[PDB]
Each structure stands twice: as structure tokens, then as C-alpha cells.
A paper describes a structure:
In this work, we report the first SSX experiments with viscous jets conducted at [name] beamline BL13-XALOC. Small crystals (15–30 µm) of five soluble proteins (lysozyme, proteinase K, phycocyanin, insulin and α-spectrin-SH3 domain) were suspended in lipidic cubic phase (LCP) and delivered to the X-ray beam with a high-viscosity injector developed at Arizona State University. Complete data sets were collected from all proteins and their high-resolution structures determined. The high quality of the diffraction data collected from all five samples, and the lack of specific radiation damage in the structures obtained in this study, confirm that the current capabilities at the beamline enables atomic resolution determination of protein structures from microcrystals as small as 15 µm using viscous jets at room tem­per­ature.
Residue numbers in the entry:
A (entry chain A): 1 to 21
B (entry chain B): 1 to 30
Write the structure that this text describes.
Amino acid sequence: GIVEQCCTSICSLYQLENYCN
Amino acid sequence: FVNQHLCGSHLVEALYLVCGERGFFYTPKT
Ligand SMILES: [Cl-]
Ligand SMILES: [Zn+2]
């Protein structure tokens, strides 16, 4: 999940964009 | 744009900015 993707590892705003409705 | 460790409310802050009007789902249970 996003916590694993973005907190535990790193991520871009594009990766974050995948979680918008 | 660059990578960065986003944690706790900073993640949701990021999401808000990125998504804005589209809205978002925050689901740490995955
Ligand atoms: Cl913190
Ligand atoms: Zn903080």
C-alpha cells in the first residue's frame, strides 16, 4: 500500500496520483 | 518532480495537494 510505497520506501507525486478518486 | 519519504499526515497532505478536487482514498490497511 501507499504507506509501504511512500513511507517505508519513497515515491513520486505521480505514484501518489494513483490514489486520487 | 522528486522522490521523498512521506509519512503520517504528510502523506495525506501530499495526497490532498496532488489530488485536490478529484479527492483521494487514504487506506493504510492496503
Ligand atoms: Cl513526523
Ligand atoms: Zn510530521
